[PDB]
Design a binder for this molecule. Structure first.
Ligand code: NA
Ligand code: NA
Ligand code: NA
Ligand code: NA
Lengths: 81, 81, 81, 81
C-alpha cells in the first residue's frame, strides 16, 4: 500500500505514543512506520508525493488498530520539535 | 507489486492455514504477507486503498502457489476474531 | 520502483545465472529480486499486475548490470520446471 | 513512496557524502537509499520508470534532511565512475 495520511479525532495515547487532537500521522505501510508530522513535514510530503490522500480525518484508536492489524505498522511520535 | 485481494474457490488448507470457501485474502507482496481478512477489515482496506483489485475470485491452491513462487508471500489465517 | 519485465537479447550467464535468449525476467526492485519466469508465471503476473511493462525486450548483460547498480537486485534462475 | 529525483542546489557534503552542485540524486524510500547517479544511470532509470518525477531541482541540505526524517533514507555517493 502507498503512503497515506490520517488525522486523529481526539487526544489519546495509541501504542504508547501521545497524540494531540488533530495530529496528522504519516502512515507508510512499506516501511511499517507511522509518525506524527509537524506542518512543515506534512507540506514537504505533499511536494514529493503530491497524490497522497488523507484517507481518514477523524481517526479513532480503533482506526489506528486496523492499521496495525492490516499493515503491521509501528506508530511513533514526532521526530523533530 | 501493489496489494491485491483474492477469494478462495473452495475450502482448503494452503501453507498450513485453513481457509473457508469464499475467504477474502489480502495479499501484500511488499510485506511478503497474505492473510484472511474479516469483512470489517476488507472494508477498511478499501477506505485506505480505494483502488485495490480483486484479481481472482476463484483462487485455487494452485493460484496461491503462484503467489508464493512469484512474490515469496507467507500466508496466514485471521488475526482477529 | 514498480515491478517490470525485461527480455534477454541473447544467451548468457549474468550474476552466475544462465539465461536463454528470450528469457523473460520478472524484476522486483521492492523485493530486490529478479528471476526467469516460465510462460505460465509470466501470464499469472499479468493477471495480478495488469499494467506491468516490458521495459526492455533486448536486455544485454550491461542492462542487467544497471538494474544491479540502481535497484540492488539479486538475479535468479527459474524456480519451477 | 515511489522513487523520485532531486537535484542539489549547490556543492555540499550531506550525511558524510560529497555532492557537486547539480548532482542528480535518485531517492528510493522503499529501499531507504538515495545515491548520486551518473547521466547514463539517470537515463536508464527513466526507461524503466518513465513517470519518475524531479520533485526538487534546488535541493538544499535542509531538503535532504527532510528526506532522512520522513523516509529514513541512507544517502550515498556514486557507485560507478
Ligand atoms: Na492538515
Ligand atoms: Na467480498
Ligand atoms: Na513474452
Ligand atoms: Na538532469
Amino acid at each position: 500500500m502507498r503512503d497515506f495520511f490520517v488525522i486523529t479525532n481526539s487526544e489519546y495515547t495509541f501504542a504508547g505514543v501521545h497524540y494531540a487532537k488533530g495530529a496528522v500521522l504519516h502512515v507508510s505501510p512499506t516501511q511499517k512506520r507511522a509518525f506524527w508530522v509537524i506542518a512543515d513535514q506534512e507540506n514537504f510530503i505533499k511536494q514529493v508525493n503530491k497524490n497522497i490522500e488523507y484517507v481518514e480525518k477523524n481517526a479513532s484508536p480503533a482506526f489506528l488498530q486496523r492499521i496495525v492489524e492490516i499493515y503491521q505498522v509501528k506508530f511513533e511520535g514526532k521526530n523533530v520539535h
